[model samples]
Target: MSSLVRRIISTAKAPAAIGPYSQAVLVDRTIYISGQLGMDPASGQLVPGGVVEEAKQALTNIGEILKAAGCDFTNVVKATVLLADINDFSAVNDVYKQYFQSSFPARAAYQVAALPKGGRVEIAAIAVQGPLT
Candidate 1:
């Protein structure tokens, strides 16, 4: 394993990590963002509405983290999404495509038993600093 120093990146635009963890950690040329829930940063409350709204907020939060790291969705090479219900996958995928365009990153979605803050969805990503390969 490579021994790399982890640097935490934070900003007011993104919801804070709800537990004892940084929103994202940069190591080497890769940034790993913690799973983002649907909580609005300003209000610190779950956004109103159901799966669609929550997915939107989650993606928005991911965008904020990417921007803070001087990167964007295009830089992301991989993503793992967790959902409370598998039925919401299609809806989440539809919203996900809006944030990422060509050269889309590899991704996997799984249904989880539970999530922090009772969030309907959570997303995390591994983004590199250079062009996707």
Candidate 2:
């Protein structure tokens, strides 16, 4: 790795990090967005719905942070999803598909024991800042 310094990125459009972490980090022109829960920035709480709606809200939160960092979904090269229920994959995928265009990023979805604030889903991403190719 190069000696580039890591930069913290934050945005009011996305929920504040609940712990001692940033919304995203930038290093060597690459950004690693933290896992976003199904939170509404305006309310600072999880959206009131099931896994599908929660997934969409989580993605929207991620998009907001990406926009704040001067990038978008196309810049994302990889993503990982954490779901409270593995059976919700299809529902989450349907919501996620609406965000990306032709170049879908490599990704994995998994079920976990639990999540912060009882969120149904979370998504974290890694992206680079440059031409999307």
Candidate 3:
């Protein structure tokens, strides 16, 4: 309808949403990606280890979701990182900086009481469809 097209983004590489939510939603050029835990795509359970591993998987999930929508990390303009404990912030940042090396998106990271599936980290993002300049 008009210039706005709504599409639900999904991919097998990423864990399916455990609740009533789409993995991501693209309305025209703006993609709203839902929070992704460190859950494994096959097991649907949080990946073992600690916050560092969880943060990596969560970002990887975001990557897969972005791929589903024909975009990538460079397309993301904003992101939110939720942590079970603020103490893990630095470790998470070490991993986070690996993927988003340049043109980093605006981000917010904070501790949360809990996350779905007892995940240590959850990441969500917003990406603009491109032809990025």
Question: What lDDT does the true structure give each of the candidates?
Answer: 0.89, 0.88, 0.90
Candidate 3 displacement at residue 105 in angstroms: 0.3
User: If scored against the real structure, what TM-score would every candidate get?
Assistant: 0.92, 0.93, 0.96
| Deviation (Å) of 10 in candidate 1 | 0.8
User: Is 1 or 2 the stronger prediction by TM-score?
Assistant: 2
Kindly list the per-residue Cα lDDT of model 3 for residues 1-133, writing each as its tens digit.
3767999998999997789999999997999999989888888888888888888888888998898899989999999999999999999999999988889999999999998778898998899999889
- Candidate 1 CA-lDDT value: 0.89
Candidate 3: deviation at residue 74, Å?
Answer: 0.3
Model 2 CA RMSD to the hidden true structure, in angstroms: 1.6
Q: Answer with 2 or 3, whichever has the higher TM-score.
A: 3
Per-residue lDDT of 39 in model 2: 89
Q: How close is candidate 1 to the true structure, as a TM-score?
A: 0.92
Alpha carbon lDDT at 100, candidate 3:
89
Question: What digit string (tens of lDDT, one per residue) describes model 2 on residues 33-121?
Answer: 99999888888888887898888888898889889888988988999999999898888888999997758999988999999988889
Please give, for residues 16-127, the per-residue lDDT of candidate 1 as tens digits: 6668989999988889889988889998888989888999998899999999988888898899999999999899999999998877889999999999888899899999
Clashes of each: 0, 0, 0
Q: Which regions in candidate 3 have their CA more than 4 angstroms from the true location?
A: 1-3
**Candidate 1 wrong stretches, greater than 4 Å:** 1-5, 131-133
